[PDB]
Amino acid sequence: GMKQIEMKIEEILSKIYHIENEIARIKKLINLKANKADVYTKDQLYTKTEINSQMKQIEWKIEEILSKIYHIENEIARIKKL
């Protein structure tokens, strides 16, 4: 059954051929992936949404300050009879 062995070998060669192709693809895919060492994880970062919320709170405080200052400027104008 030498011909039978020859058939099993060709089957094996085709399996290997497709595996080698899949490995070539995999290696390329892996090179497009980010390393753990080069990135930060979610626990280490604020999102845009979170930063926006923090910034909006600062804006609010600044606007309250601007209103206070404007009131003071008019209080001064009143004191100066001006």
Add this chain to the structure above:
Amino acid sequence: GMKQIEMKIEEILSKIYHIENEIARIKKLINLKANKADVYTKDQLYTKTEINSQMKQIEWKIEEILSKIYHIENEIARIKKL
């Protein structure tokens, strides 16, 4: 030694079987990994700790301003004899 060849073939088939299984696993693993193109690296980002430090400095400045404004309001009250 046809039986001997048959043994080597079965050994090879089992090696291939396990390789194919490992490749299937790998492909699934890879699909769960983040692409370099979709993420920022550490050099491009501030952490929560860094943002917190920056925000705390802004808070400090705002509190110094609020204290200045409160002093000015009382200076005005004193000028008004009020």
Add this chain to the structure above:
Amino acid sequence: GMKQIEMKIEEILSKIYHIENEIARIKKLINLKANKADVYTKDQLYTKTEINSQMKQIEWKIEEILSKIYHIENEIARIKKL
């Protein structure tokens, strides 16, 4: 042609040997890659450059406020003839 079969088998064994080595390497590489589940993507994050721009705008507003307050302090000094 038993010797011919023996040659094809050794060729196959060497192909498998190198594949197994490449798979071992791949598995190690994959373990160094970041998971999608553990990271944020670009659309979800501000970069250092963007945060710096936002912070610089806050600094600008704070400096404008400090200048306003300094002017008011001197207006008060003038009112007090002091």
